[PDB]
Symmetry: C5
Amino acid sequence: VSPPPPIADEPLTVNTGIYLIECYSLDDKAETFKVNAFLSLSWKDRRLAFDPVRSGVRVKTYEPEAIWIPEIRFVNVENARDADVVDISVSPDGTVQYLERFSARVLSPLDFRRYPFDSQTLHIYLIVRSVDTRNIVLAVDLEKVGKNDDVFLTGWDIESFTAVVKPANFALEDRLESKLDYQLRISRQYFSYIPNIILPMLFILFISWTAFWSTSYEANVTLVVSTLIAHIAFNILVETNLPKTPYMTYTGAIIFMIYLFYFVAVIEVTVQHYLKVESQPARAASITRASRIAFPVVFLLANIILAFLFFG
Amino acid sequence: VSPPPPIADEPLTVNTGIYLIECYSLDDKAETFKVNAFLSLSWKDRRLAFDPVRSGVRVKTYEPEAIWIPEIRFVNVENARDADVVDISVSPDGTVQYLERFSARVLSPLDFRRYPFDSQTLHIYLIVRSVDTRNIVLAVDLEKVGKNDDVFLTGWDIESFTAVVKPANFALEDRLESKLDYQLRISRQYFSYIPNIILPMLFILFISWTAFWSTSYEANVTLVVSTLIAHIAFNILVETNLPKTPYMTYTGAIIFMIYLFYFVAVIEVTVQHYLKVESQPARAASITRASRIAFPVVFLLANIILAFLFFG
Amino acid sequence: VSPPPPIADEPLTVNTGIYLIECYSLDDKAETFKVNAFLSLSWKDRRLAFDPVRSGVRVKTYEPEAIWIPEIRFVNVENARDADVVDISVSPDGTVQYLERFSARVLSPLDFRRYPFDSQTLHIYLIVRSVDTRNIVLAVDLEKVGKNDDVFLTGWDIESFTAVVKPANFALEDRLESKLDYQLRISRQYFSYIPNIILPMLFILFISWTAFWSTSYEANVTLVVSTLIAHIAFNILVETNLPKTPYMTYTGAIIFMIYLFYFVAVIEVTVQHYLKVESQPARAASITRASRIAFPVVFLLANIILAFLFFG
Amino acid sequence: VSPPPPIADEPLTVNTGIYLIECYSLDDKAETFKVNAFLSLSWKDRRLAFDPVRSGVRVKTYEPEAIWIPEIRFVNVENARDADVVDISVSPDGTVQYLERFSARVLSPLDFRRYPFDSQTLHIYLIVRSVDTRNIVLAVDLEKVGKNDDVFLTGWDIESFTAVVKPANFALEDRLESKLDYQLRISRQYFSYIPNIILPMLFILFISWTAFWSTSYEANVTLVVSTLIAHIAFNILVETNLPKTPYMTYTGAIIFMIYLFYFVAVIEVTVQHYLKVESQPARAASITRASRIAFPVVFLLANIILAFLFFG
Amino acid sequence: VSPPPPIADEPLTVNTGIYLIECYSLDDKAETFKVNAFLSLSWKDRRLAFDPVRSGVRVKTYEPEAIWIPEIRFVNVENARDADVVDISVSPDGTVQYLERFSARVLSPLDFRRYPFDSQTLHIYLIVRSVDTRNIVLAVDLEKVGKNDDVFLTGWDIESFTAVVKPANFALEDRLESKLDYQLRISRQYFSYIPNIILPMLFILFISWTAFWSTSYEANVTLVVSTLIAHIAFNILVETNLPKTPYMTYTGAIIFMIYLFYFVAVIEVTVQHYLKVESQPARAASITRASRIAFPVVFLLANIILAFLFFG
Ligand SMILES: [Cl-]
Ligand SMILES: [Cl-]
Ligand SMILES: [Cl-]
Ligand SMILES: [Cl-]
Ligand SMILES: [Cl-]
């Protein structure tokens, strides 16, 4: 049809709101995730105003191809949403109630610095492009911004779903455009990692540390190298989760520290054997008895320092 | 067209029913699964009533674009169903028989606490949204709620397919909506796990337990550590099935207990060697002869307790 | 348009036939497989009869939207076929020749009891639903049921493609429906398994069996346990083929028997060492010399019995 | 519209030609590969002939829905091509120039007998189906059969792209049909296999062969069995490339020969130890010194014979 | 409609420009990557010129089906772009402003010679095909060629986005066509490789090099062979990144050099043992003390030479 006449030469205000129904398929590698929710638009148009007393009907329904509908689009989506118009009602005063259901794929960056214990914010952007005849600005209606109680996501705890009412009215392509932001804060469940990744790793490391209570060179070599192979296999198991990041994560630092500890243990075993062969048993005994105590204290101190750096 | 006139000002009742034809692709990671079935709608409209004596035809078929059809949609689907209209017949009294075939992807939560022996319920939700002019409520017709005898699913035993007749008439978006629930209970087949996952694991553990019948330190170390590596490889084999859950499963608990047992066995071997070197052979012999009997009794007791906790 | 008038009040007969062009993508996990073939329909309609002498044309072509076409659908398909109408010709007497090309995905159960040497039958179901005005029954025309000589499938030998002429005229949804069955028998090529899976497994088992010709405990332990690890790795290699079945397959039974043999070998080695340490060398020598002969005879007998049970 | 009148009662000739733009995604497992190219059709129709002197225009463009276009389809494609009409021009004499762009997925068999050094021919089939009124035959225009210089395929060297001008005018479904064949010969690049698969395998085999220069039984057992495990792991690495074939390939034969060599080496080590224990050292020394020379000569001879059989 | 009349018989000039919004899914194996951006077309047509003084409107919007739009297509795309027309405005003088949003998949070759430290250029080609009536040439408008500040790509640092203004006006299919080139230079982030791939590899190699400080043959054999197995496992870990290339990469050369070093170390250990057994201990001691120093110097020199060759 056409934009409404400027009765007061004012920018047009539309009220929005998204009622989440379900979210799923949070792909961490591609940083994409899908939604399925509602969309309520409530603008005002005086050209559609009628008299309810004469007509005798409280609200009379028009056709989507019979009226004008402002274009509402998402920024960070691979393809356009699948719009399923559900209801349209026109109030006698002029306000038009609109509703629709859609599903789309959304792109949002993710931070994996504190991989086991991290909280992510998922952003959904709503943008309307002003036409030359009339200016249209966005708004947020708090009575429709919510989520369904059946919204479930595997491995995450949904905490809140709020929208920032302040729009960023920038200018792109010589046109003024508004933008709304919807934030969905989530938190990862870290229960299934303590008995799956952390504790077996510590058990293997402690098993490898038993070589300081022995004097047989072959047994020590077997212990240390076979535990190193087991460490590599467990890293193979763990590697199916971590994406590629340009910074240093917690898990990568821990794994590198474990590799360093294995190298130092091999060096110590070789030094002990070499001193024992060269007819200096007392020095080797002192070195191994001091290594026994020095290894785990240093391991605990390094873990404490890494935790104090990454988490504060 | 339009909703029928309120002849008695009563809510409109439609009778439903789904005849399953085939189900497949039960993805446990994403908790999605596809269907392909029928859909029977039988409502009443007096505006389409005709005289069969004058016309001479028992039932005369209309066109889907010539009548009104109430909108029936699913809640937990990624995309809209692929409707394939099959037949429409109008009875002289006013009842309209409708039929269609569809396929869709359904989301439903799954519980993996008792992973090898679990029963899941798959929910399909049917919702109709009332218009302002007329109120429409749902109903269940037991004569059409069934499944085809050729319905097959890999690894599961379909037990029943029933629909709860009671609808949850809540109010969403200032509109009254009804909801129907269809439940499909299934059970997992656990035959192919006893000789594939459980028994080889026990065999490897028993092989590792033979180190208590020997006194050679190198042989014991080789046995225990190589069996640990084999355990890690078998866990690699098993890991291609279990999803990520926020609670403790049966398999995870068993694997953690196995890791603990390996650690304790290594500790015992080291203690025996250290006592033997320090010129105390009798104490080492007593310790190993008591460990021989203590290990499997404790293993069986822990398994019994875990079974008694997870399954009752 | 409308069904033809009942000139004799007889059920309508249509002649079918599928000319396979290519089949591919036989997914064993999901038990789906795709086709691409023709479809010939030859029914009779007296309303389209014309005079060829007056018109002067042997056959005159109509439009698919100008005539009536009975609906032909598949039962076990995920989505509807992609119909590509190719030709339509109307004979003067009344017979109508119809032709089209399509591609679809078909679901059919598979039996994996004799996994290396198995023959499968792939079923394609054709169903027509009778209207209330006229009854339509199916038929098979043997002159069009065939396959193209270029039909190739990876790993399978296509043997035949026949259709059962007898239809199952059951009653579903208070309507009489007919059904046709097309069977495509195939056989798996088992050449690439003898030198890939079977023989290396036997070689590793025979290598592990050499521990009965030695008296060094450490060497025996190394041999047996390292061969067990190699067995687990080879099972990792093989596992990328077998689906999940509710019954006992041939390969699973063989693998379980191999695990049992490894366990018994470990037990025998431990017993020999324990008897040797306890100052009873003659008994240990007798036990090992009897085990040398007892192991392979028992292995061959068990293999023979499993083959006699699974294959007859 | 309709086929042109038989001015001379001659079969209609259309000139074809495909100008390749890009090819990609050569899936060896499914034997499918995608294209994107042009398609030039140049037939003759006297009904569209006009006078250029009177009109004053050299060529006047019609509409695709305003003229008749013969149907051109591919045989070995999963789905129909995505036709994008680009240009249509009608010459005054009657010849019609047609052009379009398309992309499709093509199925073609592949031969993997000489897997590292093989040349494959990719076939694209063009078929036109004659109507009852007029007969249409195909032809090849050499001025348009070519490939773009930017055509790139990962791992293959495109050599030629030619079309066989001779059509196979067979009869299918009681209709005469013509067929054209386009062949694209390619060759695999085998540089990245010599330092990736072949040489490390030889290095591991040579490492395992060092056991003939030693007399320690435990060291020999460790060497041979650990090298066997490394061989299995490297086969795991290599297995991600070879499809399933019903015949014997080069790589499979080489791997089987390697397994046989490992088995024979284990047998030789066991025999040497048994003879050494039984107080016959000279015989064991002679056997090992003869094995030292016999192993690599036999390996080289077997490799030469396999190469002479598979490649000539 | 039709091309504009040749007011001066000049080639038609259109001004282009792409404003990137987001890029993602850079598949290195298939060398494909997706985009989502804008597209501004600004051509001149005198037939749409109007009088703004008489009409009283600054710019009046037409319909996409009411005007002519030159066809703009991409060369290296699998499928056609999803055009979403956003705005069209006609200036009184005759210039027409056009805008649209699209998403597409683009193919571009990649160079993996310097895999960890490489810079790639991604090409997007724009082509317009001249009609016989009028000639259309392309142009670049620098005021619209840019990227959004939120453009993010995983693992890469976007540096610039420029378009070469010079078009390649070649002749294809007897028609003159222009082409524009858009280049997006990126660089890989190599932080997450130093502590993930390089350093553990060096640690394992250094661990294996400790065998020159020992005289026990069994311990040396265990060390070297087990470290070789760990090397193969780590290569398994690394192999999930490198595609297949017809030339020699940096990583492949390094891995081959590591394999060569392992082989030489095994040879040295065997030689030392053989000389020790044959009653020549001084020569073996000299050989091992010289190998101790010769191995790492040679390793460093080879690494320096490879770096000097691949990177200059
Ligand atoms: Cl959108
Ligand atoms: Cl729906
Ligand atoms: Cl269908
Ligand atoms: Cl096609
Ligand atoms: Cl395009």
